Amino acid sequence: ASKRALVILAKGAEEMETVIPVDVMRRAGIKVTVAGLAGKDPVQCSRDVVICPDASLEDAKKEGPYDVVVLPGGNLGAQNLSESAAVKEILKEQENRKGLIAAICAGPTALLAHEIGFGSKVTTHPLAKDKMMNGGHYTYSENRVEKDGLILTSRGPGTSFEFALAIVEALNGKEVAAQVKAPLVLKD
Amino acid sequence: ASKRALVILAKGAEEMETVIPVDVMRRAGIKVTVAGLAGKDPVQCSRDVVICPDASLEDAKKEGPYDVVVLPGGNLGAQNLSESAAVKEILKEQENRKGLIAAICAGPTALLAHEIGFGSKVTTHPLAKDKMMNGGHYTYSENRVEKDGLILTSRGPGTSFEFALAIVEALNGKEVAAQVKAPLVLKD
């Protein structure tokens, strides 16, 4: 059985934090669906890179369930994720079936918005800490990648490779992660 | 005066090696044009990420000159770059006016194809070394980023951040590179 990943792509998402996990996960043999929040139309990312999603979120919602739901960062992207009722439904369903939820940079703030994973240890971009911690519902970490139960978080564009490889390791195991890592020419 | 960058995007390009330099260069205030080799139509990258270029290469060619020409990697992308007469013309013109040429991963092999920069020190992805060195026209380096005169090269997806910041430093200087680097949460 092939593992499946849903990446939710909204206007203003950080394009590096989107492309790096999609690419790395596909190198690991995972079936990745890049789903556009607003539909099938091309999405203008935070630095004006324009990416064509594989499907609308509405369509991708019906082809579930997914072994991981991925929330990229970017301040405006995360805000769009935090305001979407469809994202709330997807996240609440993933939580209930004990599937993995992964968010990077500003992305974890959508978890707070949708009341996902309260009590977990999480990290965010430093500039997003105050927002994530409003109410003290999580415990904050400064680790570059943090995993507590089914909640996997990471800090910024420069942690995107470590974030993606942590997803691979969680889904496919350490050996596949190591095999996918070697041809990338990462430092550590 | 605002510095200008041309990124040449061909089918089969490594999407991470494309998006990371475009994003980082735009964070540095550089005006970046993502030009599609085959036209304005959306480009399917090596891991099936689909990116919409800003313009066709034909149109972007007329809005020159550029302070840097950027060649992403990906084996099939580099091959498409190596076979394109338009790329040859762009590169030969950039060489003659002593502008910067930057290529990463498999991308430097297009330089060999177009007889660009013979005698320079270059690096490539390890898997592309034998191809780059056919004929002994360059001297090979295993540095993660290599710069010899106006030729800047780098090794793979995992060196993409260092590659892009080297471009920023060459165009805008060390302080801008350092200022753009800090919010990315890079390790080193």
DSSP for B62-91? HT---SEEEE---HHHHHHHHT-HHHHHHH
Is-contact A75 A12, C-beta < 8 A?
yes
Does the bond joining B157 to the residue before it have cis omega, within 30 degrees of 0? no
Are B129 and B109 in contact by the 8 Å Cβ rule? The answer is no
- The SS3 assignment for B92 reads helix
Burial class (CB in 10 A: 0-12, 13-18, 19+), A176: middle
CB of A69 closer than 8 Å to CB of A111: no
In chain B, residues with a C-beta closer than 8 Å to the C-beta of A7 are none
- Domain segments of chain A as ranges: 1-187
- b/e for B164-184, b at 16 or more Cβ within 10 A? bbbbbbbbbeeebbeebbeeb
Q: Which chain A positions have a beta carbon within 8 Å of B34's beta carbon?
A: 49
Cβ atoms of A17 and A66 within 8 Å: the answer is: no
Name residue A122's beta-bridge partners. Answer: A140
- The span from the CA of A148 to the CA of A118, in Å, is 11
For helices B15-27 and B160-172, what crossing angle results, to 10°?
A: 30
d(CA B75, CA B71): 12
CA distances to A87, A102, B10 from A93, rounded to whole Å, are 10, 14, 39
Chain B residues closer than 8 Å to A127 by CB: 183
Long-range pairs of A83-90 with CB within 8 A, sequence gap ≥ 24: A83/A113, A84/A10, A84/A37, A86/A37, A86/A57, A86/A58, A86/A61, A87/A8, A87/A37, A87/A57, A87/A114, A88/A113, A88/A114, A89/A61, A90/A6, A90/A8, A90/A57, A90/A61
Supply the DSSP string of B165-183, one letter for each residue: HHHHHHHH-HHHHHHHHGG
Local structure of A146: helix, strand or coil:
strand
Helices A174-181, A160-172: inter-axial angle, 10-degree rounding: 140
Closest-CA residue in chain B for A29?
B47
Six-digit token pair at B32?
Answer: 């970046």
Contacts of A173 (CB under 8 A, 6+ apart): none
**DSSP class of A33:** E
Laid out side by side, the sheet with A55-56 consists of A55-56, A31-36, A4-9, A68-71, A100-104, A151-154, A145-148
**Active-site pick, A45, A52, A105, A114:** A105
Residue B156 is nearest to which of A47, A159, A184, comparing CB atoms?
A184
3-state class of B187 per DSSP? coil
Q: What is the DSSP string of B108-119?
A: THHHHHTT-STT
> How many other CB atoms are there within 10 angstroms of residue B134's CB atom?
10
Question: H-type helices in chain A, by residue range?
Answer: 15-27, 57-62, 75-82, 85-96, 109-113, 129-132, 160-172, 174-181
CB B51 within 8 A of CB A45: no
Please answer whether residues A136 and A112 qualify as being in contact, where contact means their C-beta atoms are separated by less than 8 angstroms: no
- Which residues of B sit within 8 Å Cβ distance of A? 14-16, 19-20, 22-23, 26-27, 34, 42, 47-52, 125-127, 144, 155-159, 161, 183-188
Nearest to A188 by CA among A167, A153, A158, A151: A158
**Looking at beta carbons, which residues of chain A come within 8 Å of B159?**
185
Cβ-contact A140, A117 below 8 angstroms = no
Q: Are A23 and B47 inside 8 Å of each other by CB?
A: yes
On whether the CB atoms of residues A113 and A68 are closer than 8 A, the answer is no
CA A148 to chain centre: 15
Q: Does residue A105 have an active-site annotation? A: yes
User: A33 phi and psi, to 5 degrees?
Assistant: -115, 115
User: Which of A120-153 are b and which e, b meaning 16 or more Cβ less than 10 Å from the residue's Cβ?
Assistant: bbbbbbeebbebbeeeebbeebeebbbbbebbbb
Which strand ranges, in their side-by-side order, compose the sheet holding B55-56?
B55-56, B31-36, B4-9, B68-71, B100-104, B151-154, B145-148
Comparing alpha-carbon positions, the chain A residue that sits nearest to B124 is: A185
Pairing assessment for the beta strands B68-71 and A145-148 based on DSSP bridges: unpaired
Contact B49 A47 (CB under 8 A): no
Burial class (CB in 10 A: 0-12, 13-18, 19+), A61: middle
Closest chain B residue to A21, measured at CA = B16
Do A109 and A128 touch, CB atoms closer than 8 A? Answer: yes
Closest residue of B to A45, CA-based? B23
Q: Does domain A1-187 have CATH number 3.40.50.880?
A: yes
- The CA distance from A19 to A105, in Å, is 14
- Residue B18 has phi, psi (to 5 degrees) of -90, -50
Per the annotation, the verdict on B105 as an active-site residue is yes
Q: What's phi and psi for A73, nearest 5 deg?
A: -95, -145
Q: CA-to-CA distance for B3 and B21, rounded, in angstroms?
A: 14
Backbone angles phi, psi at B116, to 5 degrees: -105, 125
Q: Which residues pair with B55 in a beta bridge?
A: B35
Parallel, antiparallel or unpaired: strands B121-122 and A4-9: unpaired
Query: How many other CB atoms are there within 10 angstroms of residue B97's CB atom?
Result: 10
Beta bridge partners of B31: B4
* d(CA A96, nearest CA chain B) in Å: 30
CB atoms within 10 A of CB A62: 7
